[PDB]
Amino acid sequence: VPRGSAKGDGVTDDTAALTSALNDTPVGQKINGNGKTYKVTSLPDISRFINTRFVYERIPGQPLYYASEEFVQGELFKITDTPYYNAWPQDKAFVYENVIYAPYMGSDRHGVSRLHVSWVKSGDDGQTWSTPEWLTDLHPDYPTVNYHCMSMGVCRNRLFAMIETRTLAKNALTNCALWDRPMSRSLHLTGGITKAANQRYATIHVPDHGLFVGDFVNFSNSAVTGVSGDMTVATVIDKDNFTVLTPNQQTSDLNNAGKNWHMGTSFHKSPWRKTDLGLIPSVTEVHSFATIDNNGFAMGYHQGDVAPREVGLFYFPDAFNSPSNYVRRQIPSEYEPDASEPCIKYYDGVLYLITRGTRGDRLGSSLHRSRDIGQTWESLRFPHNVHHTTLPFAKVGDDLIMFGSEAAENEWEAGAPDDRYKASYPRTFYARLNVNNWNADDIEWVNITDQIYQGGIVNSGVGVGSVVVKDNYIYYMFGGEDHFNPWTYGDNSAKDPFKSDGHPSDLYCYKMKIGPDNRVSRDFRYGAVPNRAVPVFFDTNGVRTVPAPMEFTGDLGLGHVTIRASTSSNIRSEVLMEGEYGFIGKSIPTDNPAGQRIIFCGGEGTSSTTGAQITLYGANNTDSRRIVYNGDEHLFQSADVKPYNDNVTALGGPSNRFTTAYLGSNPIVT
Amino acid sequence: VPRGSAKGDGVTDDTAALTSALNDTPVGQKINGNGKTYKVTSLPDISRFINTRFVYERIPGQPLYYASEEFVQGELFKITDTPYYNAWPQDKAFVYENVIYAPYMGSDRHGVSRLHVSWVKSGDDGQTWSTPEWLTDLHPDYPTVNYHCMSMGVCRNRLFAMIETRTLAKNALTNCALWDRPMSRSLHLTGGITKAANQRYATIHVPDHGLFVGDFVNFSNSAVTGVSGDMTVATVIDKDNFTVLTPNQQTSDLNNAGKNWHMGTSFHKSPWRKTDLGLIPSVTEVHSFATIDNNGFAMGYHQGDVAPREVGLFYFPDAFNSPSNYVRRQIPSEYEPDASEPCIKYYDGVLYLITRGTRGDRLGSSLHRSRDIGQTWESLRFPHNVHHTTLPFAKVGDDLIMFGSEAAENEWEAGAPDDRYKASYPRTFYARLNVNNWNADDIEWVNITDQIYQGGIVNSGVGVGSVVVKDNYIYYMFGGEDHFNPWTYGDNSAKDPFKSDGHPSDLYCYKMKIGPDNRVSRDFRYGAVPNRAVPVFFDTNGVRTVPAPMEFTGDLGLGHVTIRASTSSNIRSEVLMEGEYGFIGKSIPTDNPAGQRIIFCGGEGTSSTTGAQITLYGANNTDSRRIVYNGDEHLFQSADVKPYNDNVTALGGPSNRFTTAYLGSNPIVT
Amino acid sequence: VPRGSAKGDGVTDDTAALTSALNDTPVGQKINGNGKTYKVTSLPDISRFINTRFVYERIPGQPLYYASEEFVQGELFKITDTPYYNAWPQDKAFVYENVIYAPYMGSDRHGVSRLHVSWVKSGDDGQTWSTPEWLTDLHPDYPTVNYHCMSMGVCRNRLFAMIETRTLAKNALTNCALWDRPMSRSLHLTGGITKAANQRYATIHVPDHGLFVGDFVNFSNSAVTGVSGDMTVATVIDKDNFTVLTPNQQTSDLNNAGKNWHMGTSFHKSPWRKTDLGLIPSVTEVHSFATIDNNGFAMGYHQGDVAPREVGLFYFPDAFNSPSNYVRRQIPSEYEPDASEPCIKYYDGVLYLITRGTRGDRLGSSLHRSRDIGQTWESLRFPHNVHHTTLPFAKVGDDLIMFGSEAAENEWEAGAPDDRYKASYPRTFYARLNVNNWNADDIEWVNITDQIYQGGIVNSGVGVGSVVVKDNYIYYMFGGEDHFNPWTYGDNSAKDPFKSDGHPSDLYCYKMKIGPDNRVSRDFRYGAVPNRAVPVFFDTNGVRTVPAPMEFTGDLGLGHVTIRASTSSNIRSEVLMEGEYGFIGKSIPTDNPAGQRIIFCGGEGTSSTTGAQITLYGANNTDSRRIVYNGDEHLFQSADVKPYNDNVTALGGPSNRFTTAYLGSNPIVT
């Protein structure tokens, strides 16, 4: 009887052959699939394979693909590890001057409670990531409302973001505002600065500077007197020219032609421009961002609270001169039901849009392309009711490369019921779609990594991400959980992130190679003490020292405290108390309440031999509310020594007589 | 002359062939051993091999096995990195609701000084691990005695632990207490809550709840008025039913049958139940834990201080109703000499017990099985005097899979002398033993990873670990050191963990695959800023911000301090001082002692133009112990202004006259 | 037509064949080059290859070699991650008692501003690295001058370092000092302590102890009464014997022959010996260190500010007895032009020296060997004007193994122009040179890893490193950047490390195998919370607790503060203020300035029912500069109650009359 060899054609049932091979081979051998796809009836021990893809119909009629290690050149990274509920990169990520930005929202739930629009960044092509940065503060009217953002990008050297205001009670949208800020850049330029004689303003030529009046600009080596150091834009002449006010004037014209200098900009020292758009009608969420040209961009949106549902985009044709002017453009009505959160991108004059499907029992995600910024569209429906995921994407060559994630295990397929309130391992997929062929019937979703859905609450932070390309790599930034329960059902219904393990949702990045890497590897194993967030150095005396300024906003308990010399040429130690008032008080002692007091002293110890003392006694002291003032002089300056009330308290007592009173005149007795 | 090919049969001396192969092949080639075992006379360059095992008799007559990379599907992780002496997972680890728990002891030595019973946890199947948690405080009678624990596990949804009290002076056992606490769980249930009309108690049906009166329970969506929020157990009816006191009553009966709701529990908001067992006679250590059924469990023990030595277990048949009732069961007397620290597990009605051998020159570790919870036993001795290690284990299929570690390099073998006080690389091993065959003569110890023994002290933290299975992976949690000397012989005989590099012992976990993994990989590279222990966020002003409450118990030096608005609707800043009394004082200045003073001010600066001031002068000041009180009013409220002593001090002086005194009557002169 | 197979001979153009192979093979297949070198016209997708080297002439006539993964057994680690500008390991690294030391300089620029001579260490053969330690403080005359160091090593159990003083303004050398300190060691010894009867000194035999009078020594188990605990050296008899003063005397002679005891030493509790060498003439930098024997060592130097340039070494023949005595030795004059920063090592009586070339358009790096400590030399020039890099090295067998790094991409080659002010990926190389053959014409530079040069400033921290061997591994510790701009051109011209991402330069270590590894792997994945820098433990109450003493030197903002019991058997809470004076003040309130005040209280709350209060009112208060003193007693001790000025202020007022005054005699009215 003949056997029985694996065909790897995606159609022959290779289950038996692979089973035989696994049974016959040592467990530590890596079985090489030679880049082929093997149809099976159940997934085998995938860990024993390299360079293999499996095709499997968990649900009959719905083949999905599963990648062994090394089949794809890619790797998953964990990129945040914070106690906040960290999710929703959707759809905000971008690359700027070699830095990869993964914006997200850190909250305590699916909602805007405790929420800060945030980002982490990578300056090493995704190997390591920065300390989280808050981009927004809590709204001035917290806790009634707070901010929210799913649309962010860059246009002509400025960050643009749709900053939404929503209710904590219901996550209801109350306001839409466009916020923008110049991106920080160093520019190394030649020529372009002029300064007319006998007046103080200088004209700076910087093409597509993206700056507005009041924005920060720093200058070095200008060779134009007064154009130096930290400055601000005084006027904007046009898109390529601006002026600054210098502190001085010269008797001849100045012009730095041929001279090499440096500028200049700062996100952090420039204000946001905030353009109120009000409560944009028929909008549930603004989501995703597509830079169109030097002047503007599009943002996605959907309306999904009332009939009929809308899905489309808002095009801001000139966001520089006219931030408040946009045009609503919808996808074809056929594709709007059961759809939300479109991802949009613009390439080579084509605007591509992919929806999220809302139900696994109705037609789901669809793809659309337009050559007129959304006025007309060509469309396609992904098979099998793709749902619950956004599908962020990029175009690389002739392919859209899209990524998605089920929110919990076994929800991907059409007809698959939601399976929440239990821990699971949700599948993350990618697919390629060739734009010339324009047909998704034979789309191949390849599971490349599995996440965890914790199960302690119905909601999942898994997926809902964002995609960028940098050089020859594509990046999918997205949410995943771990098995640590947030205890929402339990002792932390309030959702305090700083109790127990806080919230399990954190960010991940799948880094996938999409073209040749013509350099030797940059990869390293991280072996350092992470020393950016709280920078610690063992001083010469052997004590951990933190030189960075820091804010501790949570309640602190301290032990022995020494306040060191710090202020006014280090002449003094200094504590400053804010608020309307400060209060320094004394707890009720647990063991000896009768001793309750604070001793204040001008010297080094509790003995009053060391300095003048004032001792405030607490109510619980045996000597209740006593004050003892103990110095070798008591000198009352600038004012009379008075009793608070009139004719109620005395100077001295029968057992506490003053020896006398030195007066400039007799007592005034009335 | 014919050569000379590697046989890989474990018996042919393959040394020459492998040497030839290594000499003839490029160093970067991975030489695949095809899953075979190669006998050699010395270990070759193992790093050049994949999927290879070597058999080597370092000591003639004692073959041991050595694994190349990929021979086993496994990986070592470092799981703690703390300055404490972190060791002794033995034998405490367990898995609960998808979380892997690695309890241990963090101290400053082999002893209970500075000791906290601790754990770290993993919520991602061992890829990353949590911030250490202290489970015990320092004993109330520290530093005479402190806690200790080598036995911990879960039975019917409660953590149970043998909390020992030992002397710091000698590590002598003084007390045994069983401590237990409900494990935190979220339950998603249907029906089961009833509340009789016209009274305030509700009955909650939760099978095997494991709760006691006073334990924490949280309810959501009960559809039973008053059964809501954070509550406590008022009564326990039976193992499956308990009641709570609600705050209200209704005129009809309530019953949430068919309704979906959520509960509820908390380790942290429930007290320990502590059951004093006294100084259990003839016990040196309680060690290891075997859950038997829904009602109870067994804990290991040995007595090794006086003849004759004992080794066995304590069976607690109903630890819920009767925590103080246990039965002592010993292994066969033949196996008690030179033995300690048994590891116990229960599977399919069989109790398995493995000892630690105490000497390499006498019969060592033995294995025992019982079908009657230790009343009768079948036994076997491991060959070659296995010693100095515990042998934690799990049963997977027909195999016990056990793990052990030499404490220092080259101590494993029978007759091998202890080799301490010098740095080395101790071998960690695993073995499989088939329970049907019941014969250890041909046991194969496979070295799968090497640790470091620092050598600065005689003692080693290497090994002494604990084993769990989760899904298709087995986990060995254990100690290892690094080369950083603790300076016990040197400048830190006191063993302060927070000097220099503290103590080199930290925890590791070997994660080994023991069945098929039928999912795509979950593996990630960690690229995040660790932001759980000290959560830092760069605020909108660019300053590192920590929102978590924190306690700093070590001495602190601070620079410039601002106390921000925090308290009473943020109306005030607040400092509260604990103790019997607080003391705020002033150091002797190093450069200008003549200036020694503190200026207290109601306003923003040292100029008294900014607010009222009181200045306390130190004894070293030129104006020694002066007090200057400087306000635009001095108002003395609620009491007479008196001198402390009688007829000793005056009002005013000849060069400091008050202009007059406003009185309601003439001075009373006596 | 025949094809077309890859020859892998380094001379046949294998470009076509490899292109064909890449086109025909699945992308996930690892293409094994079989350890061969393939000539190509452009670098292919190297990531698709294992065990392959490419030879490529980016610049015609200058072949360089490029390694795929696994061609070399090696790995890159990141070893620092600090906001300081962390660079210049050159040329300071060393191994001592199994610990690998990577000293460096952490500053804010190429200069001595904010500079601390620093190190990180590895106690696990380079897998993980310690919290940075500062070795130097800021110079007493900062900010005019500060310290600098490029030469450090160990000789007879002492650390020796050339500590330079340089100007912040220009990095001009002002002073050279030799600093040395005993290295911390634990010694486990037998015999050697004697103590003569009837007197208090004991003689300690410790060969090559390297200690001086006043150095720290700790003793355990001496069996010599009084030789115990923390002690200091009282006298040094010779290199192998020293005495200590014990606190007691005995009537007979004591001698611990045959007894096992422990000693003893401490870097941290021993002072530096500092030997001022003045401004050594004709020296720009002292760089690198070569231990010669038990008595001394050599340090490299160059002079490159004025003609003629010098390059050589300073030999300190007896640095123990005569730290101030050294001899200048130069390399052959032919090799001094365009050269700096020599790396020196001593092996088997041969002193090897390698220069840095300063220009890519003139003869560059050269290699020199001497058998007379630099009096005569044999020499060689590396081809192709090796420049901008130091070439630290070690000798392993017959080979020097050297490492170097271009500072920015495409600068390595002869004639290559500097390419700064733009981000790039600089190549790091190693080479082997056989000392018997003594010919570098055919040297093969192999690119083994690529770094990042950020481009925001002209300067680069890439490279300039140091090399050690430990066991069978060689380590190259060196600088690399990331893409985070320091904003020197932008908002941080001041170079504050603690703004934004600080400085991109951090340290890396390439760990390369150079001999057989005859042990099972020690490798682990790091999965722990890093808990050395800021050690955090979740206390039994669920709050993050830091038990280590810490210094926070940057400005702090605090929220609610509780100062816990800490001092004098925990009887009190304590705050101590340093400086000439302390100041506790109150900010101007933002919202209600009219309330500006601080309430000081002896009890727990703002209600004066809880304790005695003194309230200082600010100038902005409605009651400007009021003080209210509110207690149930006001007791003025130790001094008269006086007005500050004479006959200006009163006791009481017309609406604030004291009831009377209790006096021992009538008022003295004048």
Taking the CA of residue A518 and the nearest CA in chain B, the distance in Å comes to: 21
Residues C354 and C471 in one domain: yes
Classify B27 in phi/psi space as left (phi over 0), alpha (psi -120 to 50) or beta.
alpha
Structural domain containing residue B13: 1-72
Query: Rounded to an integer, what is the distance from CA C74 to the centroid of its chain?
Result: 24
- Resolution of the PDB structure in angstroms: 1.5
Asked if A535 and A548 touch (Cβ cutoff 8 Å), the reply is yes
Q: Are strands B393-396 and B399-405 parallel, antiparallel or unpaired?
A: antiparallel
C531, C545, C649 ranked by CB distance to B659: nearest = C649
For residue A504, count other CB atoms closer than 10 A to its CB.
26
- Contact assignment for C583 to A570 by CB distance below 8 Å: no
Q: Considering only CA atoms, which of B117, B32, B120, B134 is closest in space to residue B81?
A: B120
Dihedral, CA atoms, A564, A566, A568, A571, nearest 10 degrees? Answer: 30
> Which residue of C lies nearest to B605 if distances are taken between CA atoms?
C585
Taking the CA of residue B86 and the nearest CA in chain A, the distance in Å comes to: 19
Dihedral, CA atoms, A595, A600, A604, A610, nearest 10 degrees? Answer: -90
Taking the CA of residue C130 and the nearest CA in chain B, the distance in Å comes to: 8
Distance CA B112, CA B166 (A): 7
Distance CA C249, CA C200 (A): 5
Residues A262 and A275 in one domain: no
Which chains, if any, share at least 3 CB pairs under 8 A with chain C? A, B
> Which residue of A lies nearest to B133 if distances are taken between CA atoms?
A500
Question: Any residues with CB less than 8 A from the CB of C491 and at least 6 apart, and which?
Answer: A184, A216, A218, A230, A266, A268, A269, C499, C500
- Contact assignment for A618 to C603 by CB distance below 8 Å: yes
- Contact assignment for C649 to A656 by CB distance below 8 Å: no
- Burial-class residue C251 by CB neighbours within 10 Å (0-12, 13-18, 19+): exposed
- Contact assignment for A635 to C656 by CB distance below 8 Å: no
Asked if C261 and C221 touch (Cβ cutoff 8 Å), the reply is yes
Residues A153 and A221 in one domain: no
B44, B575, B629 ranked by CB distance to C563: nearest = B575
Distance CA C661, CA C649 (A): 17
Taking the CA of residue C658 and the nearest CA in chain B, the distance in Å comes to: 5
Distance CA C212, CA C599 (A): 56
For C616-639, b/e burial (b = at least 16 CB within 10 A) is bbbbbbebbbbbbbbbbbbbbbbb
Domain endpoint, select from C72, C88, C104? C72
Distance in Å from the first CA to the final CA of chain C = 130
A46, A120, A614 ranked by CB distance to B520: nearest = A46
Domain endpoint, select from C239, C270, C301? C270
- Contact assignment for B28 to C70 by CB distance below 8 Å: yes
- Contact assignment for A662 to B654 by CB distance below 8 Å: yes
Distance CA C498, CA B377 (A): 66
Q: Considering only CA atoms, which of B277, B378, B258, B354 is closest in space to residue B319?
A: B277
Distance in Å from the first CA to the final CA of chain A = 130
B540, B556, B648 ranked by CB distance to A558: nearest = B556
Asked if A624 and C629 touch (Cβ cutoff 8 Å), the reply is no
- Burial-class residue B51 by CB neighbours within 10 Å (0-12, 13-18, 19+): buried
- Amino acid making up residue A427: R
Tell me which chain B residues have a C-beta less than 8 angstroms from the C-beta of A129: 527-529
Taking the CA of residue B234 and the nearest CA in chain C, the distance in Å comes to: 24
> Which residue of C lies nearest to B67 if distances are taken between CA atoms?
C520
A519, A628, A644 ranked by CB distance to C635: nearest = A628
> Which residue of A lies nearest to B120 if distances are taken between CA atoms?
A501
Question: Alpha carbon of B54 to those of A438, B450, C145, C398: distances in Å?
Answer: 56, 15, 60, 31
Distance CA B664, CA A646 (A): 9
Taking the CA of residue A201 and the nearest CA in chain B, the distance in Å comes to: 30
Own/partner pairs, B362-368, CB within 8 angstroms, 24+ separation: B362/B337, B362/B338, B363/B337, B363/B338, B364/B338, B364/B339, B364/B414, B365/B339, B365/B389, B365/B391, B366/B331, B366/B335, B366/B339, B367/B400, B367/B433, B367/B440, B368/B331, B368/B332, B368/B335
Taking the CA of residue C232 and the nearest CA in chain A, the distance in Å comes to: 19
Residues B129 and B254 in one domain: no
Asked if C291 and C346 touch (Cβ cutoff 8 Å), the reply is yes
- Contact assignment for A635 to B627 by CB distance below 8 Å: yes
B-to-C residue pairs, Cβ atoms closer than 8 angstroms? 564
- Contact assignment for C651 to B645 by CB distance below 8 Å: no
Residues C503 and C605 in one domain: no
C44, C482, C661 ranked by CB distance to A658: nearest = C661
Residues C196 and C333 in one domain: no
Residues B358 and B283 in one domain: yes
CATH of the domain at B12: 3.30.750.60
Distance CA A238, CA C605 (A): 61
> Which residue of C lies nearest to A124 if distances are taken between CA atoms?
C482
Tell me which chain B residues have a C-beta less than 8 angstroms from the C-beta of C266: 487, 490-491
Q: Return the residue matching tokens 């949690």.
A: B477
For residue B499, count other CB atoms closer than 10 A to its CB.
19
CATH of the domain at C625: 4.10.1090.10
Residues B285 and B417 in one domain: yes
Distance CA A49, CA A63 (A): 20
Question: Any residues with CB less than 8 A from the CB of A10 and at least 6 apart, and which?
Answer: A37, A38, A39, A55
> Which residue of B lies nearest to C625 if distances are taken between CA atoms?
B612
Residues A137 and A196 in one domain: no
Residue C471: how many CA atoms within 13 Å on its side-chain side?
15
Q: Residue B642: beta bridge partners?
A: C635
Taking the CA of residue B222 and the nearest CA in chain C, the distance in Å comes to: 28
- Contact assignment for C660 to A648 by CB distance below 8 Å: no
CATH of the domain at A254: 2.40.30.20
Domain endpoint, select from A30, A55, A72? A72
Asked if B563 and A578 touch (Cβ cutoff 8 Å), the reply is yes
Distance CA C472, CA B48 (A): 14
- Contact assignment for B580 to A562 by CB distance below 8 Å: no
Residues A54 and A98 in one domain: no
Which chains, if any, share at least 3 CB pairs under 8 A with chain B? A, C
Take residue C641 and report the two structure tokens written for it: 């109650």
- Contact assignment for A586 to C601 by CB distance below 8 Å: yes
Residues A306 and A157 in one domain: yes
- Contact assignment for B631 to C625 by CB distance below 8 Å: yes
C604, C629, C648 ranked by CB distance to B635: nearest = C629
- Contact assignment for B637 to A656 by CB distance below 8 Å: no
- Contact assignment for C46 to A518 by CB distance below 8 Å: yes
CATH of the domain at C412: 2.120.10.10
Taking the CA of residue B362 and the nearest CA in chain A, the distance in Å comes to: 36
- Contact assignment for B632 to A639 by CB distance below 8 Å: yes
Q: Count of domains in chain C? A: 4
- Contact assignment for C519 to B484 by CB distance below 8 Å: no
Distance CA C42, CA C55 (A): 9
Taking the CA of residue B385 and the nearest CA in chain C, the distance in Å comes to: 23
> Which residue of C lies nearest to A217 if distances are taken between CA atoms?
C490
Distance CA A70, CA A35 (A): 9
- Contact assignment for C670 to A664 by CB distance below 8 Å: yes
Instruction: Write out the DSSP string of C242-288.
Output: EEEE-S---SS-EE-TT-EEEEEB-STTSPPEEEEEES-TT-SEEEE
> Which residue of C lies nearest to B540 if distances are taken between CA atoms?
C500
Tell me which chain C residues have a C-beta less than 8 angstroms from the C-beta of A446: none
Which chains, if any, share at least 3 CB pairs under 8 A with chain A? B, C
Question: Alpha carbon of C487 to those of B633, C491, C501: distances in Å?
Answer: 52, 6, 9
Helices (H), ranges, A1-94: 15-24
- Contact assignment for A556 to C576 by CB distance below 8 Å: no
Residues A657 and A667 in one domain: yes
